[PDB]
Amino acid sequence: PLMVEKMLTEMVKPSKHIPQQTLNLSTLDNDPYNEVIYKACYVFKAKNNRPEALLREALSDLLGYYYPLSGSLKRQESDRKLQLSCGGDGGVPFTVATANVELSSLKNLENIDSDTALNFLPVLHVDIDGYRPFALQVTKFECGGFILGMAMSHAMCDGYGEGHIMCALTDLAGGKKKPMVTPIWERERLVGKPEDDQPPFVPGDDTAASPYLPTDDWVTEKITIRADSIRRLKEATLKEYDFSNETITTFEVIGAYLWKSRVKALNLDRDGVTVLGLSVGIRNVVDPPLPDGYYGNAYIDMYVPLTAREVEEFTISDIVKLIKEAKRNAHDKDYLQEELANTEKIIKMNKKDGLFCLTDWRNIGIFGSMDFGWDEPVNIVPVVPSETARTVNMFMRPSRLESDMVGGVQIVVTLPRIAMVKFKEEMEALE
Amino acid sequence: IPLMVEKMLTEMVKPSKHIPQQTLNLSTLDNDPYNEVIYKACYVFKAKNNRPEALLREALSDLLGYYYPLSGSLKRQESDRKLQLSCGGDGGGVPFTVATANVELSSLKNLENIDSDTALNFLPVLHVDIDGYRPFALQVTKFECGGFILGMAMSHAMCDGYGEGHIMCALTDLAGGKKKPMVTPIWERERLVGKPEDDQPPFVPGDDTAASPYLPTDDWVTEKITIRADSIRRLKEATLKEYDFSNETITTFEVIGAYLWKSRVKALNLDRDGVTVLGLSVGIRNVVDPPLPDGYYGNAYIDMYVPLTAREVEEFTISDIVKLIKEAKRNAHDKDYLQEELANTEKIIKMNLTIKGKKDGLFCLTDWRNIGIFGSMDFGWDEPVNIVPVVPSETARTVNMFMRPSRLESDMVGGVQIVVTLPRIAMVKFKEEMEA
């Protein structure tokens, strides 16, 4: 009989005056495919000064550095580009909630239904001036433990930026006076052309159709692939083809395996083209590379097109080859600028059954310490945006308390109930 | 009373041979920042029936014609966080210290129960300078009896125990009148270089472990636990009667390591819901293809980790933990596994990420029983009466080290000695568990 009740929502402003300014964003930031809300729960165990008072104070100091987080995002009808008005002005919503259970009856969110996870996550405050891109919630439990939930405009940051923001927040909450990385803006370094005569590539357009779609009985489950299974899939993949000098990554073999199993589960039109989308960091593709204080979107999506027949008939090694080549092309500066141009064309001009995007958030907890008194979250659960979940499979790391899953990977999959049944059975073949 | 060691001189011993002037790269295993610790060991020699200090200085000078990187300077860039070793420049050489003690070897009982702080009186410090530090240093402490302690210090970034043993044996081979080291040494640290995976986030095992209610404390004690061969034999038999181990035999390292883990979880009273991690090292000399030649003295092992909850460690049988320890060893012996472990270390080095997490439940086993099995060390003052490895101060608190007893203790042939560093309260409980 779980009931989570919000007690309060305050608007928290920067601890120092910010001159009124209007900021522009990068081409990657303005990508209307990226106007989704990232969400993550940080689960803290009880202790042997209340956490919400410490975090609220740190948030106000955090906005001294990350003051664009306190502004308002709005897309201009002239540009169809985003504008961020900060300073004087604003503030980040901060919600405190209580739950009528102990943390342990939720297993530290190790198996949380992603709908149920919404009870611990804030939403973005929307207004005349647009929406504030950042929001925080603290849900206190009867054990004395608590969950720190966060929402963040994906137009504002990627996971790298999200990770530094949250760690800076807990660093300040723990007594540090400065964050360890100073944030920069510099979003004009990722600004594209666009090209007047070139029709843009739109991902998911004209992809293979599924006999099960459209439906509205979609289910989200979290699938676990153990380090044992990952090695044996790598071992077998290396025997089909020695990649010689090069090593094959877990993201590559699992990604290819998810693609195959998804195509078969959705029974995609074998003559139709299916498209694997993968994100590739480009922090070091620009010259000079972006500093660590850069927290805007700093990746581009690569796409591997195959027929559903090809995906179903190719070996795993055959697909890894294409995946590896997709990542190599991402590392060319001249390709990056034509990706940027393509995005800008999509913006300036203003279904996908049939399009499969892999997302990687295993690194959500590596960018610094989150200890500010209650010792390093016992679990970090990223929650896939409702806007994209049907297209997305997300790689995430297990709880640090799950000793039997050390070195394993968890994949959040969203499929029609029919397809999901056949999808789990294909994944069984990994063990 | 008290013990007083007086250093008489330190000179930089240079090679008796011309050596190349190079800036050498190190392997991925060598560049691991967790490996930048200083190995130390005391080699005790009794009096003949003065001379030995001078003979080892000449020997060291001849040794550096072969292991000439040892005379270089170690300095890690901040460009790529990689260590570089610069040899053959001006002012190179190995620090070589001669000291005297105001007591006879008899009164320290050949270092058989030496306190680790006392033992530091016989070990050199590593020479630091604007150009970094030398990886290697020697100290000969002369005693009133006529015997002497050969103390050595060795950066783990330079070698593992296999290379350390070959260097010390080459040093005494030379001092004994031989002209060549019996094994020709090679550098080729390029053989063990990882290729970091662009899309693979770094994985640091055992970074965040179960809490101990005794930590943090300043009240740490180090003690040497002795296990005679017949208790080892009795524990092995009992472990065989829990699980039919096939024709797999169970090793002393596995079964005692498992018992050490259980006892340590109990001694430290770790949060039973938390995760405790057992680390062990697995040589990979023959895992790489081509295999490593015997003259390779760089780091040639990978660390394997067994994670469990502190409650599973207490409830599992000894045999249960042995099956897990054997499984870890099987996986380090996969060539493709070692490539990925190499890639992950490279990625850890390059990202230079913040060190975080509770290390209370991290338990790392080292094995230095093999320190004196690579050759003779007679030159001639007769085969050392004792070889005492000293745990790096940087790792002592999460490390238990296996060592062989002195060669003068007949009652302990087949026996094992374990060096244990725990909070004082935990050491009490720990010694009680060791009593069985």
Numbering used by the authors:
A (entry chain A): 10 to 57, 63 to 103, 105 to 365, 371 to 451
B (entry chain B): 9 to 57, 63 to 449
The authors write:
Phenolamides, also known as phenylamides or hydroxycinnamic acid amides, are ubiquitous secondary metabolites in plants. All these phenolamide synthesis enzymes belong to the acyl-coenzyme A (CoA)-dependent BAHD acyltransferases family, which was named according to the first letter of each of its first four biochemically characterized enzymes: Benzylalcohol O-acetyltransferase, Anthocyanin O-HCT, HCT of anthranilate, and Deacetylvindoline 4-O-acetyltransferase. In this study, we first performed structural analyses on two representative BAHD family enzymes, the Arabidopsis mono-/di-acyltransferase-SDT (AtSDT) and poly acyltransferase-SHT (AtSHT), then explored the acceptor-molecule specificity and potential molecular mechanisms of multisite acylation by structure-based mutagenesis approaches, and, finally, successfully predicted and varified the acyl acceptor substrates of two uncharacterized BAHD family transferases in Arabidopsis using our prediction methods on the basis of a sequence similarity network (SSN) and of structure modeling.
Spermidine disinapoyl/dicoumaroyl transferases AtSDT and AtSCT were expressed mainly in the seed and root of Arabidopsis.
